[PDB]
């Protein structure tokens, strides 16, 4: 009905979303935040694509929000020899778009705040021992419900209550990888490369990309282990490493600015969190980065977990409101489709350190464009099906492994009859 | 040295055990085990040479080998009433049935034998830190306490453990199995042992799986391995017949036929929990041992052993470093993680086998294969239950020479077979 009363841990991205979502089927939603409100008080910058963009287009935020992205209608390569080489997602149509942590998370509680039967709390944390805390600590004042929504984020106090809960299954691995925040300014007012472009420098071991904000500038997020992190303690280790295996950027970026950010703080830990089941009996459920914590190497994390706020609110839709079906019918059917996300996710980490320089990224896409537009639409890459469709993840790891399963096979029997209609023709 | 203080979290068997190798190098170690003394308020497991070794370096070996039952075979009780014994490797080999109760009461016994040792039951721990906060006899008097070294032995469920999951760069996860388990008794017929008292006693299954170890009562213990879901649809005597009969049929007869009845409704069929986690230890002051560091699933018969393993390979870095924590409890987690995470490891391996994979007859091929290739090469073909059973060649390491062996022969015999033929 309209008047039970849910209550939801966190006020960020994933909790600001589902506060709207819920609010809008006239619940008593109140959103309980940690942290002072951002709007008078981890990324800088993420992709936004198609599923986020479906679920924010729900509560009728999608057309606010992709006006203050800036679209990425490619991939810009940056080669070691300095090439710089562009690959399209996908057709003209699709598109992924480059948008603010902050306007978004901005813009969100404030469309909280618009329903008149949604509150935000903020300066309220939940303690470690299910108290939520005023303004002043050891201020105990929690209140009932009907309804708790953990959107707490990685490292969440929901799950952990839930994680003593029986038949729980929970793991948590922090990657050998760590990651820090680089700008690459404006040169001259101007953007100092292509703005329409996703841009990576993808070496074996380290990997930058760079995503672009509308103050013509570039965020640029390094990956590497931990391990080099700790042999350049020194600024010219820094540039020595640079100038080796980023050529191009110290230009870009400020070349002495780049030593202020570097030092700035130290890389930061990226961790993987899975669980099952994401709810226990209809009193609560996680979402989000509480549900799954996923290494960021797909752009899918916020995406998703936008995606979990939109499939629950179409089972609220088909079984009218039931929290009791609901709640369990969230868990079998999305976990499946979360843990695939993250192992997708997880995957790609690892490919990234084994097999990826300035050529083969460029091969391995370029053939699948190949196949695409050979047997289309019985190849759809999986980039494409992650970032463009609603297709489900596991679904679309399925047709991933199958297609691959139909090329390596393709493959093969062109190779032999190459192989004997060489020696035929050879012989006579 | 004598100076420092050490508190041991939990007196099961780890504990206990680890207890005793610390006050043998006279550390001020005190127990504290939030149950009562169980000497005056797995029912029984599977004794190796791992878990031998370490008792025996703490003079223990002979008091619990002597109160235990050798069991020099696998019998395999196939659907058909057949039953096939597989030996373990040689004459010298063979692994021994014990109870977890005297185990842990001649332990705890052992524990209190030094002046230096102190054991604290009915306590229990609430919070600590690298100053820790125990539960007196009396609940809701939690008084402080200080050491040295704070060693979780609390086991699967372990507290100690549940602090360290909160540090940086700590991986951990668990995992509930779907299959739950269950202890039958065999009891006597006429005074005599109703079966073979020296095998480890088998009756395989697909979906279930029963074992059973002989007692020195002339009795023989059951656990009973099947899915939650099954037992489920067994909430009536005559559904625990039909099944008994459909299943194990040789049981009903062997069991008291309404024994079967009070023990099976006794108590519900308890989970299996795996749990793993990394790094051991933290920073010299807090170590884990046994569960609280590797709960595995029990289809090897080597929890217990190996964990007895930790203890005496910490006690082997003492030594090496002449009593340093600080080095020692690094390179506890360094040596050791990779083993007890390979034991893990096979065992998971060993309980997924078990549910497509072994009906009745495969147990007997691989095993009789096994020792045809061991007879062939002696040195080159170590099976790897005798690796694990009878050596401390470390687990990581069994499992590639494991992996290993099981290349050359499914290479040198797709040679034999695709060349050849
Ligand atoms: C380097 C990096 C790059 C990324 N790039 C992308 C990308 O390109 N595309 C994409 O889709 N995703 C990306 N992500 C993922 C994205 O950051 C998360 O998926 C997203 O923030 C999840 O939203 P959330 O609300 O679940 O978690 P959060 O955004 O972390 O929100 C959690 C909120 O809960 C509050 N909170 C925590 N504990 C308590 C408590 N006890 N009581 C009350 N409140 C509490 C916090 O203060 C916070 O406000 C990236 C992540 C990283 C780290
Ligand atoms: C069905 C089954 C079969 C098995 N078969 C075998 C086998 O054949 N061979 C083999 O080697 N192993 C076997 N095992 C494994 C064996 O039971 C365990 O390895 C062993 O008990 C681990 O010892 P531990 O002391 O670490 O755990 P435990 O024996 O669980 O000891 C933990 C102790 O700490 C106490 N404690 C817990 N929390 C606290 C707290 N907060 N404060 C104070 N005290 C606390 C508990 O009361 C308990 O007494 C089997 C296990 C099962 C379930
Ligand atoms: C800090 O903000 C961040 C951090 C990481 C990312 C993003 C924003 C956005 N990123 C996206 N990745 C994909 C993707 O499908 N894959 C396989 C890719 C994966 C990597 Cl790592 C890459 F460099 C390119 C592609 C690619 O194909 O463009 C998208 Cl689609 S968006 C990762
Ligand atoms: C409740 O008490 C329990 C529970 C489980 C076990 C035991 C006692 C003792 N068990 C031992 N297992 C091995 C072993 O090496 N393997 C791989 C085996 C694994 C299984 Cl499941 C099995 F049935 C036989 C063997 C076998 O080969 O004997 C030993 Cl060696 S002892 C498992
Ligand atoms: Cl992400
Ligand atoms: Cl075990």
């Given at each position: 009905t309209e008047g039970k009363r849910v209550v939801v841990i966190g006020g960020g991205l994933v909790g600001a979303l589902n506060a709207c979502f819920l609010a809008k089927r006239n619940f008593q939603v109140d959103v309980y935040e940690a942290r002072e409100d951002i709007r008078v008080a981890r990324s800088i910058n993420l992709a936004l694509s198609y599923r986020g963009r479906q679920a924010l287009k729900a509560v009728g935020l999608e057309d606010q929000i992709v006006s203050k992205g800036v679209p990425m209608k490619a991939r810009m390569i940056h080669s070691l020899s300095g090439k710089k080489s562009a690959i399209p997602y996908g057709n003209k149509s699709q598109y992924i778009l480059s948008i603010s942590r902050e306007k978004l998370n901005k813009d969100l509680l404030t469309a909280v705040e618009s329903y008149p039967n949604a509150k935000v709390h903020f300066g309220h944390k939940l303690s470690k021992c299910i108290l939520t805390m005023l303004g002043?600590?050891?201020?105990?004042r929690d209140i009932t419900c009907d309804l708790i929504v953990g959107?707490?984020?990685?490292?969440?106090t929901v799950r952990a209550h839930l994680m003593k809960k029986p038949r729980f299954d929970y793991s948590q691995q922090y990657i050998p990888h760590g990651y820090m925040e680089l700008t690459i300014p404006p040169k001259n007012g101007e953007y100092a490369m292509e703005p329409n472009c996703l841009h990576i420098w993808p070496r074996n071991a380290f990997m930058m990309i760079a995503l672009p904000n509308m103050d013509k500038s570039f965020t640029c997020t390094l990956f590497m282990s931990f391990e080099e992190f700790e042999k350049l303690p020194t600024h010219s280790d820094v540039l020595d490493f640079f100038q080796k295996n980023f050529p191009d950027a110290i230009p870009l970026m400020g070349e002495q600015a780049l030593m202020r950010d570097f030092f700035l703080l130290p890389a930061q830990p990226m961790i993987s969190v899975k669980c099952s089941p994401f709810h226990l009996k209809s009193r609560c459920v996680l979402m989000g980065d509480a549900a799954h914590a996923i290494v960021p190497f797909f752009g899918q994390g916020m995406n998703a977990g936008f995606e979990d706020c939109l499939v629950f609110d179409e089972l609220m839709d088909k079984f009218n409101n039931d929290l009791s079906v609901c709640l369990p019918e969230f868990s079998r059917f999305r976990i499946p489709d979360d843990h695939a996300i993250s192992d997708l996710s997880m995957y790609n980490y690892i490919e990234m350190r084994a097999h990826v320089n300035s050529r083969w990224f460029l091969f391995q896409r370029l053939l699948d464009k190949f196949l695409h537009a050979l047997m289309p639409s019985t190849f759809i890459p999986l980039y494409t099906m992650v970032a463009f469709?609603?297709?489900r993840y596991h679904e679309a790891v399925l047709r991933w492994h199958w297609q691959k399963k139909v090329i390596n096979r393709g493959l093969f029997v062109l190779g032999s009859l190459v192989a004997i209609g060489s020696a035929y023709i050879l012989v006579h």
């Open positions: 002043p600590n050891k201020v105990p959107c707490d984020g990685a490292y969440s469709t609603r297709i």
